[PDB]
Design an enzyme around this catalytic site. Structure first.
Site, PDB file in Angstrom:
ATOM      1  CG  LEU A  22      -1.872  -1.198   1.324  1.00  0.00           C
ATOM      2  CD1 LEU A  22      -2.836  -0.996   2.478  1.00  0.00           C
ATOM      3  CD2 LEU A  22      -2.625  -1.424   0.021  1.00  0.00           C
ATOM      4  CG  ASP A  23      -0.369   4.515  -2.655  1.00  0.00           C
ATOM      5  OD1 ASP A  23      -1.302   3.696  -2.526  1.00  0.00           O
ATOM      6  OD2 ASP A  23      -0.529   5.665  -3.113  1.00  0.00           O
TER       7      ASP A  23
END
Lengths: 56, 64, 178, 168, 459, 75, 603, 62, 85, 98
Positions: free
Chosen positions: I39-40
């Site tokens: 995830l960013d």
């Protein structure tokens, strides 16, 4: 221990004695101003039997 | 403490009569007084004139 | 529980906050879940479009224009969580919150109504009273010579030492005191 | 025990009950229950208390003030006569206030009693209060906070001088 | 009247010769008894005043004020007990003697039959008040406040003395009865205009009038609690009583001369209530509220109509009680936190609920919630002003709205919101303080039941 | 699982209310009882024309019995 | 007749008994709210009896039990006017209070000071009864200010919330602005008619002038949240929902309309005041309904509905149909209190959530509240043969068949359409659709107090309209014959509003996003009246106070004029006199000058 | 930045920005939470006017 | 609604498992979104919004950005709601 | 600049030494007796008794007397046909106009 109580708490008599003295002096002042005791044109009445003053 | 002192005590020592201060003081101090005097005086005079002329209704106005 | 703020918001942080505000206002406009999901994926794509802009001036100008768009398109009455600031229940139970120090003024009969809790409270008082001096020493030692440049406070360095300035955070009133 | 002449009340005309339906009237039974539960015990208590009062009946009397010379016949700086006249005028002021109160009480009672016909059927009381109000205003209004018999006399004289000027 | 005066005098030897422990107790007992004695004066013949003797008389105006004074002394003693604990016995006795001398002078002012005796004692009241403010105040500004108060009052009073002597020379007597019965009308002349100004200005200074009220905020903020109590409750009403008594001499010229003072008061009540909206000091807020109410009373007196006078008397008594209680409530918080800044102490309702209830009732009376005697007086004044001019209602209603706003604003700021975290010295309210607030409140609510007592002679 | 609820001291204010109520009632209840007894038994006087040749006492011009007593005793 | 006075006075006096017992131990115990509820219920049952007596024979009475004080020619006495309005409104108000308190026991169970809440409720009820049953303007003012103060206290029930304190202060401010006109009315009546009793005021004022009636209009606008003084009512929703439902929905807010109705015989004479009441009511109806259309908080929506209904009552007064306005008050109490109780149930079920956007699919989740709210909405929108039909339909029919300002009639019809619209809004967003509330489902309406409290008002909304309308004597000449479209206008406009609202609400499902229109912003921001009116005058007054009154006059100019300049002059003269030189040569020359000058001037 | 010396009496006091206390971020831990003010911070001259319960200058959507 | 610690953990893990981008099998209490997962930043914002919507209480952004771990979310929720077990 | 004693700490709470302080003094006995004196002579004596004394104060204001005189006058004047209230406070004959 009554002597002890009165010796340190006699100050509580001054003010009630003051009230009595005030009542007496006020009654004396009322005595002074009795000029028109019953000489008004409104409350002037014939003294009822066994009466000398209307206290006015 | 600084806020209270500045809001209450420091105002007058750091006040100088200046044209803005003087003019605003004059206006917001006396102008409303004269305005209300004018309004109320005119109203009172009108009422008195009507009363003298007998041209005012006070039929039940018995509690003043 | 709030973290100490930073002097400035980094560009990444500002973009994140704008994204969160935009999603929340879109949710306010898009009441139904499906429509909200559709337009939220659209917004995510819009952010991904310029996610990798190399020119910081260009990214900054994009941020500015997007903020203008947000202000025009903000919901007049955005949804507010009930306990969040501006919410219906924000600070509702504040009057019920009572500071711990009010206890020390209790009459001995009331304190005898709950002995055991007050024994525990005396233990906590002893703990705080003992730990204060070490906390002050630690704060002096870790503080830079110029002075504390951030609101952040150091953790306990050694065992047997409580976190510096811990009393009020730990003994803060319960959210729902009743 | 109030005098009917002082506090007039029109004679009471109450329609007779003329039921036209078989359903029992709840008001009648509720009033009978109220009678039995409340009115009878209350009547008994008042009977007891009136008996006790009659056991020791004593009378109080209403004072009579003989009329005294008015400020009109009182001499200047004659503080005794001025005092008597001023107190008499104050008593008369109080009596006039009470008379106005009686007329106003009649007015209110008549407004309530007539109902929706108040505008027409209370006209006589309205006229009575009109006259009493005009007289009271002329006699006492505008005298001020420090009202005195002398100021009322001055008002009367101003009015009469105005009347002579109107007579021209 | 000596039934009240002589015991009040005897209070001084009793206080001086009482043991160090029992000074407050003895003073309180006997002052309460004196007030119980004073309660007899309320019975007033409708037509005529109670002329006890040549020197002293009472009417339906003086009797409520005397009862207020006699009731106020024990309340002042209860309030002043706390902050005078550290003082030496001689200093505490001196303070109590100043209070007793003030009560004696006030009683003799309200009962005196001669205007010159009234002036002598009414100016004599300054000395105990000045000594109290300048000796037992807690700030460096007490000296300046005392100077301001003394010099304002004296600058007002000295022309009154000259005018009273001139009246004695012209008419021949300053006895109020003779003046009322003879009362020849004035003529519109510059000499008579200046006599009117001389008679009126002393009382206009005593009743804080807009532009002459500067002494009141300084005095009330800087004085100790008891001194503030007398200043708010009776010392201002001294002006109202004087003006009502003195208005008999100046019958016709009042119509011409009232407009400056009438407009000044009518605008000043709005101005002072607006000041109350933005005050940062609780005592100052209460002081400006007093200024506004007294301006209303000034309007009522100047209008010179029966309803105006009745409302004036009712407002005087009601405001005296309300302002004394409000000063006591503020003093309690001041003792707890040692600052008068409104913002410093917040959310005290959670900490002190019964005190919060007292604050609520005090503010409700201050904003004239019916059927409080405050509202009775204010409403009578408003109706009298409306008869004087229908346009007065605009100013009167605006003043009422702002009074409600500032009263509830004080209540909200002091007693509502989150408690100030760092303040830890708040402690359970003592039975003395709650007793003082109750002694302020209960008479005020009770007087509503029988309002004819405080409606004045014209009732 | 009862959790302690922090609250200010109540002994002092409740004691204040108790003492105030006790001292009010200490004379109120005798006063209320006496007022009720006087009204029930002694009652209020009846308005009667002055008998010819009689000068009533000042307290005899007042209806309520307690008012008469106060007028005769203190005035 | 003899039982009438006793029963009517007992109905009020019983309510005071819990207040007196609040000093007793019952206040400490948990039994106090139940005792208060039972007291209110017994009061309602008793109040039923005089209502029956009046229905049977019209036994109206006035009771002047206590003589407070006589002020020269004016006598002020505690007098209660037990006429048709009082004898009908007392049972309605008592029934609504009974239901509200039973609901509050469930809704306010967690609150630590529930006893204080119930006591404040009884205090408000007593004040409102004083207002309704008052024959003197002073007693009515006592009730007026008591209702105001109780609203102030109850709105700011959670003293922690700054918003609650702001709302309470705002309500006090607007109601005091109304009280300005009220005091004007009292003063005018005292000065002219020499009485504050309604009876003498009615008797003397055959053709009432404009000023006292305009003052009454201002007071009514303040209490009934008319336009210019409206914002306090929507802000009042900051208080607990039972407080809203009782006072600021059904009972307190009708105070102004009831005050105008009480003065209807004077209102008939003056045409201008009737026109102003009509215009103000039309403005209120339109503006408040438009605001409600776009609101997302259920309490706000219902509050704006209350304001619109109050405006309709004011319009009815303007059309010179007072008894119909009283009837509408009676019906509105029932159905609006029920709607607010349903809203409170929804809020409590959804953990203090009030935004309709976070509420969905509750039609089956809460069957009983759903049925109650549907019935309440149908009654509110004028569904035939419901409580609303007996009042609102007659209102509209009388408005159409009367000499009327054209724009007022048009605005009333549009407002009825918008009432249907916002009823559609609440039903559609809240009960219909798919659930949007947080995951944890805590929905549970199976509480006997809630169920029974809503049951009583449901039965009332269904049948009270018919029952009361049949029983009350005819007080208006009916509009017998009218054009068919004129008769059916209420239904036609209501159905059109329903259809348009349903279509627009359906359009929300479509996956299309459009930026807000200006009209939507105007409606949602409440017409911008809060935003500018609560900022510009407040800022100007507070700034003017501080800058001019506190500083530029008091601390600067008055001080400079009298004290400071004189002190400075005396200081300068003191410096001159105490020259601190003391040279024999210098002041001996002054002796020579003085001798010469004296010889010249004084011979 | 001191107030302009025009004789009003402000003197040394600084001209703090006219931002209502509503505008200040609620989430931040304030020394005085109800007032959203920290200790030692210079206090606005008209802070009482700009309290959260009184005149508000927070930005409006329109 | 006691809202115990285990309940908070279960609900947070439930939301995360319902997240398509996170594969359920490797999801763990200590699985950092930035490092352990893919995830960013925007995914962190989205999961924080999902958590605050699930629990109905709003997480301030300064605190919200610093979670970076499901266990951190759980303990933060516990601190806010005064969960001691 | 001067040798002065340190400012005394906030006056010691009377609660600390005697928890049932009642205030009014440091020593508990005088505390209790001061509160008893205050409560008795104010609430019990002045408030209650004086309230009754004022409540039953004789109507020397002549309110009832004024009402009775008004009733007699109204009855007489209505009976004899005289106007209820004469417009002239004083008889015109005694007045000598200029």
């Amino acid at each position: 221990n009554v002597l002890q109580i009165v010796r340190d708490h006699w100050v509580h008599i001054l003010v009630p004695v003051g009230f009595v003295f005030g009542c007496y002096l006020d009654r004396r002042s009322d005595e002074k101003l009795t000029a028109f005791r019953n000489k008004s044109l409104l409350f002037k009445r014939e003294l009822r039997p066994n009466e000398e003053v209307t206290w006015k | 403490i600084r806020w209270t002192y500045a809001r209450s005590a420091n105002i007058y020592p750091n006040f100088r009569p200046t044209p803005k201060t003087s003019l605003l003081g004059a206006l917001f101090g006396i102008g409303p007084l004269f305005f209300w005097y004018y309004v109320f005086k005119t109203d009172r005079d009108k009422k008195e004139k009507l009363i003298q002329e007998g041209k005012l209704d006070q039929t039940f106005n018995i509690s003043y | 529980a709030f973290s100490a703020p930073a002097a400035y918001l980094t560009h990444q942080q500002k973009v994140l906050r704008l994204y969160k505000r935009a999603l929340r206002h879109l949710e306010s406009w898009c009441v139904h879940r499906d429509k909200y999901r559709y337009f939220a994926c659209l917004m995510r794509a819009r952010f991904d479009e310029h996610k990798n802009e190399k020119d910081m001036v260009k990214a900054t100008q994009l941020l500015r224009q997007a903020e203008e768009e947000f202000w025009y398109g903000q919901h007049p009455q955005p949804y507010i969580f009930p306990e969040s600031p501006g919410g219906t229940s924000y600070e509702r139970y504040e009057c019920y919150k009572v500071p711990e120090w009010c206890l020390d003024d209790w009459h001995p009969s009331e304190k005898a109504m709950y002995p055991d809790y007050f024994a525990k409270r005396e233990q906590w008082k002893r703990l705080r009273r003992e730990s204060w001096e070490r906390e002050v020493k630690q704060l002096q030692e870790e503080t830079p010579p110029g002075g504390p440049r951030t609101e952040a406070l150091p953790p306990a360095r050694k065992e047997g030492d409580l976190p510096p300035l811990w009393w009020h955070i730990v003994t803060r009133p319960r959210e729902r005191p009743m | 025990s109030w005098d009917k002449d002082v506090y007039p009340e029109p004679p009471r005309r109450t329609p007779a009950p003329a039921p036209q339906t078989s359903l029992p009237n709840p008001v009648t039974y509720l009033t009978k229950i109220f009678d039995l539960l409340v009115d009878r015990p209350v009547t008994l208590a008042r009977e007891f208390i009136e008996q006790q009062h009659a056991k020791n009946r004593y009378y109080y009397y209403h004072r009579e003030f003989r009329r005294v010379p008015d400020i009109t016949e009182c001499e200047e700086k004659d503080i005794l006569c001025m005092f008597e006249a001023e107190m008499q005028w104050r008593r008369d002021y109080k009596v006039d206030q009470e008379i106005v109160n009686i007329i106003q009480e009649r007015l209110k009672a008549c407004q309530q009693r007539e109902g929706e016909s108040y505008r027409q059927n209370c006209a006589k009381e309205l006229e009575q209060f009109t006259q009493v109000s005009k007289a009271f205003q002329d006699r006492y209004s505008d005298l001020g906070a420090h009202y005195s018999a002398r100021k009322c006399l001055a008002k009367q004289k101003q009015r009469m001088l105005a009347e002579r000027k109107a007579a021209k | 009247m000596l039934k009240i005066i002589i015991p009040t005098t005897m209070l001084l030897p009793m206080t001086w010769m009482s043991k160090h422990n029992m000074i407050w107790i003895n003073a309180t007992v006997h002052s309460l008894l004196i007030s119980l004695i004073s309660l007899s004066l309320l019975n007033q013949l409708g037509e005529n005043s109670l002329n006890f003797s040549l020197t002293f008389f009472s009417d339906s105006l003086s009797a409520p004020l005397l009862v207020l004074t006699t009731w106020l002394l024990p309340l002042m003693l209860m309030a002043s007990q706390s902050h005078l604990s550290k003082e030496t016995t001689t200093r505490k006795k001196l303070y109590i003697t100043m209070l007793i001398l003030l009560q004696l002078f006030l009683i003799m002012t309200f009962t005196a039959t001669e205007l010159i005796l009234f002036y002598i004692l009414f100016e004599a009241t300054l000395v105990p008040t000045l000594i109290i403010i300048t000796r037992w105040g807690n700030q460096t500004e007490r000296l300046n406040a005392g100077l301001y108060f003394l010099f304002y009052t004296l600058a007002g009073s000295l022309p009154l003395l000259v005018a009273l002597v001139y009246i004695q020379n012209t008419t021949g007597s300053l006895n109020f009865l003779i003046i009322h019965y003879w009362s020849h009308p004035l003529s519109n002349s510059w000499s008579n205009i200046f006599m009117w100004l001389a008679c009126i200005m002393a009382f206009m200074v005593k009743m804080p009038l807009y532009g002459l009220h500067l002494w009141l905020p300084k005095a009330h903020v800087e004085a100790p609690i008891a001194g503030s109590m007398v200043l708010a409750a009776v010392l201002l009403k001294l002006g109202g009583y004087g003006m009502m008594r003195i208005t008999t001499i100046l019958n016709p010229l009042t119509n011409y001369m009232a407009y400056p003072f009438l407009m000044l008061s009518m605008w000043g009540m709005i101005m002072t209530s607006s000041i109350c909206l933005r005050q940062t000091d609780l005592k100052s807020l209460i002081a400006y509220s007093s200024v506004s109410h007294m301006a209303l009373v000034i309007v009522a007196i100047m209008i010179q109509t029966p309803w105006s006078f009745m409302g004036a008397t009712a407002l005087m008594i009601a405001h005296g009680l309300t302002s004394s209680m409000l000063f006591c409530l503020a003093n309690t918080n001041y003792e707890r936190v040692h600052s008068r800044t409104m913002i410093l102490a917040r959310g005290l309702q959670t900490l002190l609920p019964l005190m919060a209830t007292w604050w609520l009732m005090a503010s409700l009376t201050n904003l004239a919630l019916p059927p409080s005697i405050n509202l009775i007086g204010e409403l009578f004044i408003i109706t009298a002003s409306f008869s004087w001019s229908n346009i007065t209602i605009i100013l009167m209603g605006m003043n009422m709205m702002i009074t409600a706003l500032y009263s509830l604003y004080m209540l909200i700021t002091t007693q509502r919101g989150k408690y100030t975290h760092h303040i830890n010295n708040i402690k359970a309210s003592f039975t003395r303080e709650n007793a003082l607030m109750a002694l302020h409140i209960l008479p005020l609510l009770l007087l509503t039941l029988n309002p004819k007592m405080i409606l004045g002679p014209l009732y | 699982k009862r959790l302690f609820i922090i609250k200010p001291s109540g002994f002092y204010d409740r004691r204040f209310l108790k003492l105030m109520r006790f001292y009010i009632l200490l004379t109120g209840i005798p006063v209320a009882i006496g007022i009720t007894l006087v009204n029930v038994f002694i009652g209020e006087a009846e308005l009667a024309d002055i008998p010819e040749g009689y000068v009533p006492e000042h307290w005899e011009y007042f209806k309520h019995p307690i008012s008469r007593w106060i007028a005769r005793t203190f005035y | 007749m003899n039982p009438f006075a006793s029963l009517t006075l007992t109905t009020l006096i019983i309510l005071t008994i819990p207040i007196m017992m609040s000093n007793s131990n019952i206040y400490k115990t948990n039994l106090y709210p139940n005792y208060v509820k039972t007291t209110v219920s017994y009061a309602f049952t008793l109040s039923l009896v005089p209502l029956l007596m009046f229905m049977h024979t019209g036994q109206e009475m006035i009771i002047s039990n206590w003589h407070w004080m006589t002020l020269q020619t004016v006598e002020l006495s505690l007098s209660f006017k037990m006429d048709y309005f009082s004898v009908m409104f007392i049972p309605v108000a008592l029934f609504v209070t009974w239901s509200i308190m039973e609901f509050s026991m469930w809704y306010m169970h967690s609150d630590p000071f529930i006893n204080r809440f119930f006591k404040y409720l009884v205090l408000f009820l007593i004040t409102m009864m004083i207002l309704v049953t008052a024959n003197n303007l002073f007693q009515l003012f006592i009730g007026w200010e008591g209702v105001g103060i109780m609203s102030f206290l109850l709105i700011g029930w959670w003293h922690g919330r700054t918003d609650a304190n702001t709302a309470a202060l705002q309500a006090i401010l607007y109601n005091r602005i109304g009280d300005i006109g009220f005091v004007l009315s009292m003063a005018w009546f005292l000065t002219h008619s020499n009485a504050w009793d309604l009876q003498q005021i009615f008797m003397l004022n055959n053709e009432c002038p404009n000023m006292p009636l305009i003052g009454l209009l201002l007071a009514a606008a303040g209490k009934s949240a008319q336009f210019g003084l409206h914002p306090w009512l929507p802000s009042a929703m900051e208080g607990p929902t039972p407080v809203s439902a009782l006072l600021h929905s059904s009972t307190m807010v009708v105070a102004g309309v009831f005050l105008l109705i009480r003065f209807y015989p004077l209102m008939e004479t003056n045409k201008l005041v009737q026109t102003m009441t009509l215009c103000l009511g039309a403005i209120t109806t339109l503006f408040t309904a438009l605001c409600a259309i776009t609101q997302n908080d259920i309490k706000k929506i219902v509050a704006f509905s209350t304001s619109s209904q109050l405006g309709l009552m004011m319009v009815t007064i303007g059309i010179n149909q007072p008894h119909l306005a009283f009837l509408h008050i009676c019906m509105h109490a029932f159905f609006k209190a029920m709607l607010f109780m349903c809203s409170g149930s929804i809020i409590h079920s959804l953990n203090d959530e009030q935004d309709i956007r976070k509420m969905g699919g509750l039609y089956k989740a809460m069957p009983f509240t759903t049925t109650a709210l549907i019935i309440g909405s149908l009654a509110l929108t004028g569904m035939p043969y419901l409580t609303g039909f007996y009042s609102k339909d007659l209102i509209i029919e009388a408005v159409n068949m009367s000499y009327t300002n054209a724009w007022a009639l048009l605005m009333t019809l549009i407002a009825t359409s918008l009432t249907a619209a916002y009823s559609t809004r609440i039903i559609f967003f809240a009960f219909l659709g798919k659930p949007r509330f947080p995951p944890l489902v805590l929905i549970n309406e199976n509480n006997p107090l809630l169920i029974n409290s809503i049951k009583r008002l449901l039965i009332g909304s269904i049948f009270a309209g018919f029952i009361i309308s049949n029983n009350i004597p005819p007080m208006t000449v009916p509009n017998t014959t009218m054009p068919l479209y004129m008769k059916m206008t209420a239904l036609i406009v209501t159905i059109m509003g329903f259809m348009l609202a349903l279509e627009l609400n359906n359009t929300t499902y479509y996956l299309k996003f459009k930026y807000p229109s200006q009209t939507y912003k105007f409606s949602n921001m409440l017409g911008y009246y809060p935003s500018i009116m609560h900022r510009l005058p407040t800022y100007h007054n507070l700034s003017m106070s501080q800058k001019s009154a506190s500083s530029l006059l008091d601390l600067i100019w008055l001080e400079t004029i009298l004290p400071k300049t004189t002190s400075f002059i005396q200081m300068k003269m003191s410096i001159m006199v105490s020259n601190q030189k003391g040279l024999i040569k210098l002041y001996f020359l002054s002796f020579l000058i003085t001798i010469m000058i004296s010889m010249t001037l004084f011979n | 930045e001191p107030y302009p010396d025009d004789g009003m009496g402000y003197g040394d006091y600084p001209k703090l920005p006219d931002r209502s206390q509503q505008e200040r971020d609620p989430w931040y831990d304030w020394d005085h939470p109800d007032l959203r003010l920290n200790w030692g911070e210079p206090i606005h001259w008209d802070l009482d006017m700009y309290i959260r319960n009184r005149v508000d200058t927070s930005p409006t959507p329109v | 609604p006691p809202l115990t610690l285990e309940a908070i953990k279960d609900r947070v893990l439930y939301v995360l498992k319902l997240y398509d981008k996170i594969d359920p099998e490797k999801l763990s209490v200590n699985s950092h979104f930035m490092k352990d997962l893919g995830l960013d930043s925007l995914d962190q914002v989205e999961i924080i919004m999902a958590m605050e919507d699930e629990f109905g209480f709003e997480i301030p952004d300064i605190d919200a950005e610093k979670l970076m771990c499901p266990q951190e979310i759980v303990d933060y929720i516990a601190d806010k709601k005064d969960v001691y077990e | 600049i001067r040798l002065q004693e340190d400012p005394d700490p906030e006056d010691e709470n009377l609660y600390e030494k005697n928890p049932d302080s009642h205030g009014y003094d440091k020593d508990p006995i005088v505390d209790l007796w001061n509160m008893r004196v205050v409560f008795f002579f104010g609430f019990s004596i002045v408030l209650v008794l004086g309230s009754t004394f004022v409540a039953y104060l004789p109507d020397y204001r002549m309110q009832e007397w004024a009402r009775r005189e008004a009733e007699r006058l109204v009855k007489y004047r209505e009976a004899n046909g005289l106007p209820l209230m004469e417009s002239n406070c004083f008889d015109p004959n005694k007045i000598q106009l200029p």
